[PDB]
């Protein structure tokens, strides 16, 4: 239980429909190379687009991404405590959160409902997670590697994915095509046919 | 080979702010503001994690105060506007007289404020539509999703309308069952 989070602190000073907009952005990142093994934590900060000050778990202290973020860098690294927290990031923040979701995000798996249809064949894979998947066309036990193409991986924001893999070909009277799907939700190579 | 991002932002003058966890591009949960409660982008995560509530707000108010400062560091340099890039597509393949969902893709935009309309033929009707909050991209631009449960009539033509300050005038990206 108990999902945890991170936090930020002030800068130097204080503060106070066509109106000109302003935007602040804070991304606490994380990066996991194969599980709880080597882990890279990132604490970023932005202004509009531009990244100004940063913290790399591998640099052990706040650096600067522009002279525009120069001060905040020196300012935070001047605070003993905080640096001892962010230094522990990977273990308090990353490993932890990851530990909670090692179930319903990392290991979460769902079947790839697969269809097919001319519009040139089409092969529509749907509602599958993760999106790491192989789809290869087959003409009569041979693999057709050319003249193919992919819509690539698509994202629905609901955790399902989707992809359209087209195959441009001219058939004749009694051959058989095939569309083959392997996603690590499947013990077997799910397939579909056309004639 | 994996990412856990907790991205947050404060926006002035609109004074609106967001708090969310992007895991591998799809959202986990975002703490709502008015409601001031945990809201998952998917409920199946409902009883596992259980995130703090006002906890978000603490950050947010911070990010505000950071913005106040970081503004006077630039000599009050405003935001460079960005247009969205819109495409509308069907969840599964569209069949005849089969249930389905339109998904409106607004992408690569900023600041994170948009007005979306689901209308047919020009009929502004919304029956149990759905909208996900802003998802952060690599370029720190923004992503978003409006859904639209619906049925495939060879008659109707459904349309998506997105208003943003990046486009000098409202955008209409259409779709029709073919």
């Amino acid at each position, epitope marked *: 239980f108990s999902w*945890g989070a991170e*936090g930020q*602190r*002030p800068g130097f000073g204080s503060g106070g429909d066509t109106r000109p907009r302003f935007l602040e952005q804070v991304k606490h990142e994380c990066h996991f190379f194969n599980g709880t093994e080597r882990v890279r934590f990132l604490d970023r900060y932005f202004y509009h687009q531009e990244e100004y000050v940063r913290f790399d778990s591998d640099v052990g202290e706040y650096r600067a991404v522009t002279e525009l973020g120069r001060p905040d860098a020196e300012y935070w690294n001047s605070q003993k405590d905080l640096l001892e927290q962010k230094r522990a990031a990977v273990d308090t923040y990353c490993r932890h959160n990851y530990g909670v979701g090692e179930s319903f995000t990392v290991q979460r798996r769902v079947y790839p409902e697969v269809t097919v249809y001319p519009a040139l064949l089409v092969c529509s894979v749907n509602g599958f997670y993760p999106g790491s998947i192989e789809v290869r066309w087959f003409r009569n036990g041979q693999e057709e590697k050319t003249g193919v193409v992919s819509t690539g991986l698509i994202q629905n924001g609901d955790w399902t994915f989707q992809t359209l893999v087209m195959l441009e070909t001219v058939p004749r009277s009694g051959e058989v095509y095939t569309c083959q799907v392997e996603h690590p939700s499947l013990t077997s190579p799910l397939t579909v046919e056309w004639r | 080979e994996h990412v856990i991002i907790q991205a947050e932002f404060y926006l002035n003058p609109d004074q609106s702010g967001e708090f969310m966890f992007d895991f591998d591009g799809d959202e986990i949960f975002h703490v709502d503001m008015a409601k001031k409660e945990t809201v998952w982008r998917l409920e199946e995560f409902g009883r596992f994690a259980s995130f703090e509530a*006002q*906890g978000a*707000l603490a950050n947010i108010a*911070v990010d*505000k105060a950071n913005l106040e400062i970081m503004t006077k560091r630039s000599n009050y340099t405003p935001i460079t506007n960005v247009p969205p890039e819109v495409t509308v597509l069907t969840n599964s393949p569209v069949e005849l007289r089969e249930p389905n969902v339109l998904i409106c893709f607004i992408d690569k935009f900023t600041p994170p404020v948009v007005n979306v309309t689901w209308l047919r033929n020009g009929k502004p009707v919304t029956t149990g539509v759905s909208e996900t909050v802003f998802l952060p991209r690599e370029d720190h631009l923004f992503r978003k999703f409006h859904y639209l449960p619906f049925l495939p009539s060879t008659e109707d033509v459904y349309d998506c309308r997105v208003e943003h300050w990046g486009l000098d005038e409202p955008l209409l990206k259409h779709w029709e069952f073919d």
Partner: T-cell receptor
Amino acid sequence: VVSQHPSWVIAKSGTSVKIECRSLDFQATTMFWYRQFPKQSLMLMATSNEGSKATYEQGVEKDKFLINHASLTLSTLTVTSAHPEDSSFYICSARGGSYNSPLHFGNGTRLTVTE
Amino acid sequence: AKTTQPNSMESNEEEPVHLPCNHSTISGTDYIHWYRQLPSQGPEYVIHGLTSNVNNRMASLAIAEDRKSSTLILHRATLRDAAVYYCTVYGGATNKLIFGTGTLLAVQP
């Protein structure tokens, strides 16, 4: 460091009691208002995130206590409709940010309100 | 209800005093803070740590292997240590500092 003014005070059976809290140096993103009754414990009344709706922990008298938290510094906990049963030890704290930001306290304001 | 402590406890001057704290079970990322209060005045910081062990001036800190229990250590107890010692939890899952029931220590001259 943070100062609580006034440190002592007394008013009528009801009145406006305006208790400030000021962070003399750092910017205060968050404010915690604790009140402590005689030989009891430290109870958490409210939370003021800068320029926001102040969240009152459950079991409070609601609009009875009002937090004006203003910019980064001036923070006004004002209690109107004074009551004898409310005389207590009122302690305020400031924070240099969100989670795991050291919680910086203050003097605290001891108050008796008679009729 | 965050963490539990014994209401009151007695010691002797110059004597080492060990202060028990049991918290239930606490989440993965939360620090354990120990705050104390002079008889009438604001509270004040003492010491904290994730796991393992930690010590500084004014005191030391004993965290159990499973992080189920913690113990505040006072090497040589002076008269000014008489006070209430609160044991709380502050961290990633708790933004708010939730003040416990308390341990009152009276040290005898």
